[PDB]
Amino acid sequence: MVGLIWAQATSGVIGRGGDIPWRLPEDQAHFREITMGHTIVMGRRTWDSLPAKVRPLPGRRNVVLSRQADFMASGAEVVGSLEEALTSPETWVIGGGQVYALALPYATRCEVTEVDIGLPREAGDALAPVLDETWRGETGEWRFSRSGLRYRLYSYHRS
């Protein structure tokens, strides 16, 4: 099982300037719950976005995708292809934009947090991948985050 998990603005933006233009503690808890214990695969830029004092993310096999043969990610595995990372029973691809696009053919689940923030797409933004007709989607109710933004959770599945 390979799943993708991301939070997006309604526009599809997931990242800007190498970081994220919101922070929802409820989304962080959801992300932690879904990925805990499992493999997490991230692009090198997403690894770079984590403060050194917080990485590797606890309780998970942290894997970083990079073209750099000597790139060192202390506390993680660095691999040069996504296929190398898929050896565990449950694998979550945790971003960013480039790696979601690369992982989508292997994926059967997408766990999406939609953040009700009006954020037009700008050049250089990382975006959520486009899900074609093979994906079945299940939507939760809109909720209020303590950060003031509404959010809702989608669960997309396909065989």
Ligand SMILES: NC(=O)C1=CN([C@@H]2O[C@H](COP(=O)(O)OP(=O)(O)OC[C@H]3O[C@@H](n4cnc5c(N)ncnc54)[C@H](OP(=O)(O)O)[C@@H]3O)[C@@H](O)[C@H]2O)C=CC1
């Ligand atoms: N809202 C959310 O849920 C999430 C948001 N984000 C945001 O997304 C943004 C980062 O996403 P993005 O900029 O797309 O960068 P990625 O995190 O997708 O990492 C890109 C890097 O992955 C490596 N890579 C890409 N393609 C390949 C390949 N074919 N083979 C080997 N290695 C490859 C390269 O590493 P190298 O250059 O070392 O070769 C490349 O620079 C940030 O803003 C981050 O905050 C991140 C995760 C989730």
Ligand SMILES: CCc1nc(N)nc(N)c1-c1ccc(Cl)cc1
């Ligand atoms: C809590 C933010 C978040 N929410 C969701 N729904 N998915 C994610 N993949 C992330 C995320 C973004 C960047 C990093 Cl470094 C780790 C996780």
Ligand SMILES: [Co+2]
């Ligand atoms: Co689990």
